Amino acid sequence: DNLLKLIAEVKGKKQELEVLTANIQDLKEEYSRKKETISTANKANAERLKRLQKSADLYKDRLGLEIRKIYGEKLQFIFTNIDPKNPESPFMFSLHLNEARDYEVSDSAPHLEGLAEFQENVRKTNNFSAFLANVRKAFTATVYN
């Protein structure tokens, strides 16, 4: 009677706990596969970044030029291996894309008046290689001053 109702209640509570914990283990398995996928994605992206960093470091080392990004949406170019007395002298200039979708030089090292003379030409020709070759030549001339 009442005891039968109570044992029926406990049996119901039994298989409900069993089902719920079973779905808990199912979600545990899904979580483990998710974390495995996340970890392997991390490893793959990290290896790709390491290869890219090796290439960029080779470029920076051989050329001496160092390209970095700084706040204010500025791209900072640092030229070294120019001054013979110390090749570690950083000859830096900052280029940034303006509001009008145009490149423009920000500064130099030291304060050099040959800022625009290359920026109009790089705006028109869009020749970055010759632009930076001319910039390096200007820095070299500035060194001997």
């Binding site: 044992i7 509570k13 010759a130």
Partner: protein, 112 residues
């Protein structure tokens, strides 16, 4: 079996409490997995645009393609600066960085 049914009832409601603790541990694992997923996305997005475009800008500025699978301390590659491309074959073990950089920049065309 009133008392037996009651003691069994206590046992399984306890089983509910341990399985709910397992569920909350699972939920904190869910938060953990979400934070690593966001970290993956942020990392990849930063890395690939940044590194790929920095390398491509380096190469565009230099017009130089390196031989990455060469022996270390051995500058090898192709210079597209001159009108006729010429092979870069230097040796950093005998040449200073100053000379190497100056020579590499010399081969770059300065004409606008």
């Amino acid at each position: 079996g009133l008392q037996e049914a009651g003691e069994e009832d206590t046992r399984l409601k306890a089983s509910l409490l341990q399985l709910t603790r397992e569920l909350e541990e699972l939920k904190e694992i869910e938060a953990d997995l979400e934070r690593q997923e966001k970290e993956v996305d942020e990392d990849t997005t930063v890395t690939i645009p940044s590194a790929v475009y920095v390398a491509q800008l380096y190469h565009q500025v230099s017009k130089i393609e390196w031989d990455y699978e060469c022996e270390p301390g051995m500058v090898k590659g192709i210079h597209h600066g001159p009108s006729v491309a010429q092979p870069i074959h230097l040796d950093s073990t005998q040449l200073s960085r100053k000379f190497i950089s100056d020579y590499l920049w010399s081969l770059v065309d300065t004409e606008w």
